């Protein structure tokens, strides 16, 4: 009943793949066939993808490769890669429409997890290349990044000591001047941001084609601005890089705080404060500017007339999901629900950074207080007497035929599908200002624990809260 | 005892959502 947060689903070419842990298989549902009002049999389009060698560990996450030919099955005690079978025939179904397809499975680093019983996989990520062979990066509890190629499963291509809870890739960037003596070529690499539980964020440039001494140096900790009295907390649980220019990093805490960090380039110290660093390698270390901090309503806050009944700080790990349709939007999944966060200042930051050094009006427009938009979309713990129904799978469909939709699957296999969106000033902007919402009532999941009606008091408090918001 | 009270609260919230929807649709019809 301590059902952990998982991500056991992915979408491939408009087919939903759902991992079944008991059968060690994917169930496939063609979403485009469900749109056709076919008067005939509620079973036309389900296929089962069987692992030829099943995982020997509990799968917590499913990761589609950038090449869309491989699926990583990720657990705290191992990783296994499933090769996606070929599509052919009249419907473009797997292996021509066979009900049960045997899929080749490949264990990654198996000997390391079997020999080191105390080792835990913290995160796995794909290297963000669509043109190269798929490489898997493993972050483990020994603070080591291990890079594997699907051609050599036993020997990591690269092992990097971080002497870490999460990491994510930024977009392909030109390396700063100084990361390589004397090449006239702009070398490009992926920035990997690496988060510690302490909130400390590090940067590393990774290129798999070039083994240069500068490519794979750990940089940081990246200085955070402004200074915070608590140093931004010690319960950091997830990192997401948004594909924005400049890069925006989202740091999430177990308490439900979200820090929006703008990545700033390091300045060359203008030559008048030369007081003593004897390290003659000015690596221009980038800085993190915390533009905004946002607290998620992880559990529904009720007004009780007792301001002192122990805020049971409902802390839980948050998982961050990039929106493929809106680069300034992302989604948060946690044990008690789903939130969406939209950076409403993003287009103004872009306008300000595109404005030359003389546009004081754009800075004043950015400095005009603009909070992000937070929407609590799904609440799986609507009442205090109820256990949450943890999210087991989360995805965003972006397809021209299906439209834009969120899919959530709970731990009780409840499938929830939601469409997502993609006189100073005209009088219309003033009316939009009045109609601006700061909160909404989430979709409340009634967790189907048959055996008591909730207390009438908690139901009245929930109705009171909902009525007040309306 | 908790189940009947939760069902009563959920029914009252559904009645209020239905009432507010009717008031919004009257306000839209008037405006």
């Amino acid at each position: 009943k301590d059902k952990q947060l998982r991500n056991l689903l992915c979408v491939l070419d408009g087919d939903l793949l759902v991992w079944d842990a008991e059968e060690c298989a994917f169930h496939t549902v063609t979403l485009r066939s469900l749109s056709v009002e076919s008067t005939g049999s509620s079973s036309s389009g389900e296929q089962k993808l069987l692992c030829t060698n099943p995982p020997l560990f509990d799968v917590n996450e499913v990761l589609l490769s950038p090449t869309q030919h491989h699926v990583a099955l990720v657990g705290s005690k191992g990783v296994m890669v499933l090769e996606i079978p070929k599509r052919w025939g009249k419907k473009s179904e797997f292996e021509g429409g066979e009900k049960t397809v045997n899929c080749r499975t490949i264990p990654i680093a198996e000997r390391i997890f079997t020999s080191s019983t105390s080792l835990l996989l913290k995160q796995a990520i794909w290297y963000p290349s669509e043109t190269q062979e798929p490489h898997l990066i493993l972050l483990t509890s020994d603070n080591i990044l291990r890079l594997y190629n699907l051609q050599d499963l036993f020997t990591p291509v690269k092992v990097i000591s971080l002497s870490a809870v999460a990491c994510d890739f930024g977009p392909l960037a030109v390396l700063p001047k100084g990361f390589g003596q004397h090449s006239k070529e702009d070398t490009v690499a992926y920035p990997l941001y690496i988060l510690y539980e302490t909130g400390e964020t590090y940067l590393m440039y990774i290129d798999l084609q070039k083994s240069n001494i500068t490519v794979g140096k750990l940089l940081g900790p990246l200085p955070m601005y402004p200074a915070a009295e608590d140093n931004y907390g010690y319960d950091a649980c997830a990192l997401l890089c948004l594909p924005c220019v400049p890069n925006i990093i989202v740091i999430a805490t177990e308490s439900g705080l979200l820090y929006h960090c703008v990545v700033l380039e390091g300045e060359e110290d203008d030559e008048q404060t030369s007081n003593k660093s004897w390290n003659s390698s000015c690596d221009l270390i980038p800085s993190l500017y915390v533009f905004e901090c946002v607290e998620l309503e992880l559990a529904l806050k009720f007004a009780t007339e007792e301001e002192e009944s122990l805020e049971l700080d409902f802390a839980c790990p948050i998982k961050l999901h990039r929106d493929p349709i809106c680069p300034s939007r992302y989604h948060c999944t946690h044990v008690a629900g789903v939130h969406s966060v939209g950076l409403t200042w993003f287009n103004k930051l872009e306008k300000f950074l595109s404005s030359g050094e003389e546009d004081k009006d754009s800075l004043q427009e950015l400095a005009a207080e603009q909070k992000c938009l937070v929407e609590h979309i799904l609440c799986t713990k609507p009442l205090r007497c109820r256990l949450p129904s943890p999210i087991q799978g989360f995805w965003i469909i972006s397809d021209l035929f299906l439209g834009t939709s969120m899919i959530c699957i709970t731990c009780d296999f409840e499938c929830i599908v939601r469409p997502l969106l993609t006189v100073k000033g005209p009088f219309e902007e003033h009316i939009r200002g009045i109609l601006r919402r700061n909160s909404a009532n989430p979709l409340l999941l009634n967790s189907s624990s048959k055996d008591s009606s909730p207390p009438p008091e908690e139901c009245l408090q929930l109705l009171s809260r909902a009525t007040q918001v309306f | 005892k908790v189940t009947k009270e939760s069902d009563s609260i959920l029914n009252g919230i559904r009645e209020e959502i239905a009432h507010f929807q009717k008031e919004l649709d009257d306000l839209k019809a008037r405006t």
């Binding site: 609440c379 009532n441 999941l445 909902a466 918001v469 | 209020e16 839209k28 405006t31």
Partner: peptide, 29 residues
């Protein structure tokens, strides 16, 4: 049971919000 009732009222509220915005647009026209 309470959670199912909350989820139902949240969906009814989002549907009523959409209907209200459509009616407000029609009244403005």
């Amino acid at each position: 049971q309470l959670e199912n009732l909350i989820n139902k009222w949240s969906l009814e509220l989002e549907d009523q919000e959409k209907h209200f915005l459509q009616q407000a647009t029609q009244v403005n026209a």
